[PDB]
Design a protein around this ligand. Sequence first.
Ligand code: HDD
Ligand code: HDD
Ligand SMILES: *[C@@H]1O[C@H](CO)[C@@H](O)[C@H](O)[C@H]1NC(C)=O
Ligand SMILES: *[C@@H]1O[C@H](CO)[C@@H](O)[C@H](O)[C@H]1NC(C)=O
Ligand SMILES: *[C@@H]1O[C@H](CO)[C@@H](O)[C@H](O)[C@H]1NC(C)=O
Ligand SMILES: *[C@@H]1O[C@H](CO)[C@@H](O)[C@H](O)[C@H]1NC(C)=O
Ligand SMILES: *[C@@H]1O[C@H](CO)[C@@H](O)[C@H](O)[C@H]1NC(C)=O
Ligand SMILES: *[C@@H]1O[C@H](CO)[C@@H](O)[C@H](O)[C@H]1NC(C)=O
Ligand SMILES: [Ca+2]
Ligand SMILES: [Ca+2]
Ligand SMILES: [Ca+2]
Ligand SMILES: [Ca+2]
Ligand SMILES: [Ca+2]
Ligand SMILES: [Ca+2]
Ligand SMILES: [Ca+2]
Lengths: 688, 688, 229
Amino acid sequence: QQFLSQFYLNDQDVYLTSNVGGPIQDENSLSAGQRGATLLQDFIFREKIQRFDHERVPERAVHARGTGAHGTFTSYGDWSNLTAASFLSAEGKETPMFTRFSTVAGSRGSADTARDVHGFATRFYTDEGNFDIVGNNIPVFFIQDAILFPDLIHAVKPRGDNQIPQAATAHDSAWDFFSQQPSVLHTLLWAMAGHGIPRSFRHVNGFGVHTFRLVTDDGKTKLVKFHWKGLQGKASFVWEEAQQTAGKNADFMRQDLFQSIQAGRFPEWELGVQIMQEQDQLKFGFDLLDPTKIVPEELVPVTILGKMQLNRNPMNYFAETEQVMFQPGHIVRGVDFTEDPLLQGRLFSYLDTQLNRHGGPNFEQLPINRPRAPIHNNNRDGAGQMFIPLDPNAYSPNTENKGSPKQANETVGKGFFTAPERTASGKLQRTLSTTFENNWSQPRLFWNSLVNAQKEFIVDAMRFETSNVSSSVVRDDVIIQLNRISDNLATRVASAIGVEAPKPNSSFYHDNTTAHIGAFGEKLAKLDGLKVGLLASVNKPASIAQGAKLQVALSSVGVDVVVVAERMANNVDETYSASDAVQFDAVVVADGAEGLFGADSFTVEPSAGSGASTLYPAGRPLNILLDAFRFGKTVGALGSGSDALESGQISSERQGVYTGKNAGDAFAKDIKSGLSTFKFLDRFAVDE
Amino acid sequence: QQFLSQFYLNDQDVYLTSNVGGPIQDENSLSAGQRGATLLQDFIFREKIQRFDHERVPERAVHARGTGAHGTFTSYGDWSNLTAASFLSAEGKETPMFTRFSTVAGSRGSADTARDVHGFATRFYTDEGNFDIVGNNIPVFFIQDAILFPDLIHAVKPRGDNQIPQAATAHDSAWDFFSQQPSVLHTLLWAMAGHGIPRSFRHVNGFGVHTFRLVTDDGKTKLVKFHWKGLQGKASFVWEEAQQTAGKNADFMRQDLFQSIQAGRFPEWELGVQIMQEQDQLKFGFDLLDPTKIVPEELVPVTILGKMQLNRNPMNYFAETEQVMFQPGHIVRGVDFTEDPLLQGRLFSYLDTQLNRHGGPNFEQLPINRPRAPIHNNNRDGAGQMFIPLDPNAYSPNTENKGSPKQANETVGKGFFTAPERTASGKLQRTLSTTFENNWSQPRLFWNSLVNAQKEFIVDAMRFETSNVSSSVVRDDVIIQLNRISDNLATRVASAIGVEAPKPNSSFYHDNTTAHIGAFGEKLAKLDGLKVGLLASVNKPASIAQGAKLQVALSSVGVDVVVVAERMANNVDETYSASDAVQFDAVVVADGAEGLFGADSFTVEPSAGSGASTLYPAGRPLNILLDAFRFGKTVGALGSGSDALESGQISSERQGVYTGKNAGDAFAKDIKSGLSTFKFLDRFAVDE
Amino acid sequence: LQGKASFVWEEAQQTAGKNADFMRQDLFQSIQAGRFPEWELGVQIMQEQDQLKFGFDLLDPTKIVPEELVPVTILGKMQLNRNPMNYFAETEQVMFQPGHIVRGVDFTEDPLLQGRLFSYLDTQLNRHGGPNFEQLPINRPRAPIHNNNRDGAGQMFIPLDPNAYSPNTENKGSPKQANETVGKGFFTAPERTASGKLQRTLSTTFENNWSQPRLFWNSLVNAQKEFIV
Ligand code: HDD
Ligand code: HDD
Ligand SMILES: *[C@@H]1O[C@H](CO)[C@@H](O)[C@H](O)[C@H]1NC(C)=O
Ligand SMILES: *[C@@H]1O[C@H](CO)[C@@H](O)[C@H](O)[C@H]1NC(C)=O
Ligand SMILES: *[C@@H]1O[C@H](CO)[C@@H](O)[C@H](O)[C@H]1NC(C)=O
Ligand SMILES: *[C@@H]1O[C@H](CO)[C@@H](O)[C@H](O)[C@H]1NC(C)=O
Ligand SMILES: *[C@@H]1O[C@H](CO)[C@@H](O)[C@H](O)[C@H]1NC(C)=O
Ligand SMILES: *[C@@H]1O[C@H](CO)[C@@H](O)[C@H](O)[C@H]1NC(C)=O
Ligand SMILES: [Ca+2]
Ligand SMILES: [Ca+2]
Ligand SMILES: [Ca+2]
Ligand SMILES: [Ca+2]
Ligand SMILES: [Ca+2]
Ligand SMILES: [Ca+2]
Ligand SMILES: [Ca+2]
């Protein structure tokens, strides 16, 4: 914060000024008399409204919806035998970071919990330049050449005529593109699985996707995949739950991150690489240059390099988060590119697109984009030039400035250098590499590797999405492509959408698996920032008191207890009116609250003598309980609170339903076990 | 579609070209060899990606989320004794229009069904220039001077540090502003009523808000308020239903408008004016220049001038809807401004802000912004100059171009002119007019005029919103202000939010009313575009066949029947998985579908012998039925389908619950009655 | 076709003081008077195998090919015959690019040409302030435009196809791909090849900076040698 603080404007206990330091008032326009017309000479009015009129900048062309935080990276070692990268040169070396997380398709103001691929962009402000890894929460991408990006994005984004639907692939054009371009199938399966709808940005992993090169000072190279291994654990929603969240809290994930950092529950990821040789490019049975392929961890383990912690929220969202401009071209000595055609073309786009966002060429001068290293070059001028270059002779080679700035290369001045043994060979061509042609084996690998419930979630997602596809041609084409992955997958989807069950095509069928690839099936490592909703009643103060008692039992694992009641009273956090199942990771009915959960509460006539509350909609408490159960959450009841379970026809013998006499350690232990499991998969039907 | 068709690009059965007409292919980057790096000389790659990189423009600073349609205005008379405006000069005279509807606060991907004021912007492409009325669905606005706009908007928009919450006033800053600036109270009550959450853009009225002047050729004036009286009827949601819609269909209102127009169900509004004299400005006990005040129709009736019909969807949303640039400064001869300080400052803002959106001065040259009248002036150059001016002598007065273009004024060339008797008098000042100081009497008028259920909806909205306000100071200030409107209102809100009930402050209390001002209490005029969801089962084909039978009986009133079943089969429109109560204005259980509605369906363990379906989430059918009932919708059941009502504990004795033996005329009659009532308000509890 | 004519320095200076617009005036007036200036387009035609055999590199833009070695073959004639109606709209806004290339022409590996291709597409964003500069009247083609490019500030067209992607079935596979064999598409010369290490180097073939300057010097009349001096 030492660096960014020089740009801070503090407006505590001060008089209002114009942008040029003249004290002003800004509450009334200058008029000709009491009820007269506004005067043109009112410069106070015009400066204020002009700033307002011009507040907005274009949203990012993709990843418009996102949030950011500051953090710090610590290297676990001296990695100089692997890479010349300065930030990895010493055990314990620390580097400031900024990270932005995002969805892909939706505009500004679209819901956090849309089903989508998610961005995971991390900047290291190194002493040898800014280094950005611009990644995703899924290790593979839809397409194999950057030139196809506008096609993919035009297909996924809303229709050109009416701009429907927002932040959704559940329309004809998306599935038309997916079925015409089978390279998309691997990423599609990841997005239709739990990875498309994570619980929070703290509960995902990150991936660089592309194979990169690491390069030593003497020019030796390794090929690597970058991994950000999350230390909280993977947690994901089911679709109906993600939808309800979009309606109740569009800001769910950004709120989760902000609040976690404010509470000192700093999320962490370890940076890892799968280290491979130049000679490994084809020998695994797929091309390392193909961004639709993973390298299974069974073939190449992840070597951990260091740890990122996110530990500070922005002071001003627009200045920091909205204006941060990442680029894969922000590369440092010790890293180099590969010939992955998706990566290759990305390099062009991120430099060009900042001209759109910033409106001029000097976007690297924005505080959030500036390096924490000296800038010395002969670049000059441009709109919004915030520096004053002292050298009036901005050219090389020069004698007029005694030959400075001096050229830096492999051997002098620690210059960037392209890996010296990289070579080109062959005819100039516009072709799809013959090595890129297997679009189906890895999707099948992913499919095989999932627990039954997550296979069902993929099926259910595809049934939902393709039932919204009007074109019979598209529906049929989708089933043909899915069938090349798995005849089981294809048949299960086909049955919902009026397409005839296809015959097996066994070309790519196999039974191989890779470990723990799904979003479901593992317990959480940390419970930090999960929320238990305690459903209480102001009419029974003892029910409210159970909140504090449960909180004390759960405070050591970083879980918050939220007390919900009919109205704000002492020790009540939220009202039933303002509450929903989707706000909580677990729901517990307090002792004495059971009267609010009558089985007839949904439909009873709210007549005068009926006693029904106006403080919340009919059936709200029971709705929260039943939604929590149906969505697969931990459900509990204390004392006579268990009568509410009876009202909702929820049997306590079911997994992830817990009862206890009072909020003691025994009950808290059960709740922690439930929260660790996170979602109880036995509440979801699976195809027979 | 004569005029705009000159700008159409038709891409049917053609070869791909660059932007300069060279045929190209665009599916593979040019590489050095099969697996080589991408070449800089690939201009095809770069032109394609550059267009993509620059697709986005800044969203509108307010009303970013909106939708548009083309239409036509027809004058009902020769209004030349009232105004010189050409578009009103003859009975039957027709004028093309473009109209955009919007919310205010949310960014461009935010949900249609957020609670907000709504925009209602209408352009007339008249034969004497573009004339825009840039209005709202509410006749009063929050603030009394345009200089306060950035304050209001910064307060209602998301927090500066974290950009939370999206498209919502349910946070501290918004209520801080409302309570510090009591002028906001009138609009606040409208927005907290049904008018904040309308069913569609077809079911709202429009208002110009400000007093304007109409001016005849000889300089005589009247003061007017503009009205757009909707011919469909007012229909609005309840809050819990609006939230659910935001999660299921962010595009609900834009989809409704698009589909209605495609179906030939063209929505209509009548343009009306309240006609007043210059001498009436202060006569009614408030100032006509005060945009927080209505003129009750009991005092001045609405004179109907003509009719707008929306009858054509855009061909390309971005080109037409996103790029349309409305301005109150688009005024024509026969109309003039008033000294309303809100209107006065607006004029500056709309000219200035288009420079942000368009990136340059020539925004009036965009096809959607072009006039349908001649352009002849000495304006020149600017980025994006799409014309070639033949006159090289662009100044007045001139002899070099023989004195052309010639000045047009009141008496020659039909020039615009300011109303000739307008005067200024008094000291230049930055003050609040003493005539603007009553912030409370009219909110009380509005409050008095609502049906009991809508009073409750306001209370429930304020309870919801202010329970999300953390500051005790803000919560208390809110109650103090509400108490000056009505002690009943203030007391009912205070009880939910932990504020002591205030004692009456009767300064502005009164019992006056104005008729039909609420969103609730009147039957719909037309049922066009309303939807009946028929819940059927593929296992009982006769259930599905009831759809066609019900449809034939409802066709004549423009109501669609949507057949919902477990899977896509013949005559099935959508699946249970893809369905929700919020999609339908009425829900009917078909004869033979009753087996899907088991009372234990929410919580039953999906064992093999339970025979639970994987085709939809647990309890989906019953959930649709129960939600429909709780939200106040028409519910129905045919034959044995009535068993489903019993499972859901819905008594057929309740209003808006209809049973029928079969899908005949007798049943359609009941459904028509239910749909015209639209919402059954006896299902909502009211404070005693 | 008019012939070469040049000033002496002291004369060029005096002209700058008396008429800053001398050359633009000359052109405008000549066209107005119907004295249309003309140039013949010619090419020196060489083989792929000729790249190094003349004693310098054809990829080196600091070298001429003397007409004694390769004659100029005349292809056609340009005549300039109409002044703009509005200087700003036409002349100021015209945005040239070497990347405006057509089927039948291709690039070479001249590193000056190679990098130019980037600059002229990028720099129009500065001048026009947005991506739709090819829509200015002076920049529009006299051929149909059909593609899936969309939006951008200053979008002057209304694309009717709401499905702007390839491959598609929703628009029946149109616009269709054009290449060497179908639809008269642009194509890169098919026998061009790449070989060698990726590198940031000055080609060893580019190293003679002095022989051709001497050729030029030798070839001038005495007075023009003096003018250089
Ligand atoms: C050639 C087009 C192209 C392609 C093929 C990709 N991207 Fe990209 N991406 C852009 C073009 C782009 C962009 C248009 O340049 C954006 C929009 C805003 C920006 O700064 O860059 C961007 C933004 C963007 C962001 C948001 C950065 C932020 O938070 O501000 C992320 C996380 C990614 N991309 C990630 C990826 C991944 C992991 C890719 C495949 C492995 C990928 N993109 C392929
Ligand atoms: C001085 C600032 C200011 C104030 C006091 C107002 N507006 Fe405004 N409004 C703008 C400044 C603005 C703007 C920033 O200029 C916008 C954003 C985009 C644009 O074209 O104008 C705009 C947009 C905008 C739109 C959207 C037009 C469209 O669909 O593109 C509507 C419907 C309104 N306004 C309506 C109103 C009403 C009914 C007002 C009060 C009676 C009002 N505004 C006061
Ligand atoms: C690098 O490799 C050398 C030789 O294998 C080894 O002795 C040295 O310890 C390594 N350096 C580090 C920092 O690991
Ligand atoms: C780097 O620059 C130095 C000094 O100018 C030069 O001698 C050397 O050849 C360069 N090194 C490499 C590896 O290109
Ligand atoms: C698994 O993968 C290996 C290596 O590619 C392959 O040889 C083997 O046949 C596969 N086995 C199965 C179970 O299909
Ligand atoms: C306008 O009023 C004049 C004078 O009273 C009269 O000629 C006529 O009735 C009116 N004309 C129109 C346009 O109705
Ligand atoms: C309008 O212009 C005409 C022609 O110059 C002039 O005679 C007349 O007085 C002008 N002013 C008004 C107010 O009509
Ligand atoms: C051009 O496209 C056609 C039709 O798609 C294809 O068959 C052919 O291989 C392509 N021609 C060349 C020379 O690449
Ligand atoms: Ca290729
Ligand atoms: Ca629900
Ligand atoms: Ca249990
Ligand atoms: Ca004033
Ligand atoms: Ca009834
Ligand atoms: Ca600009
Ligand atoms: Ca070189």
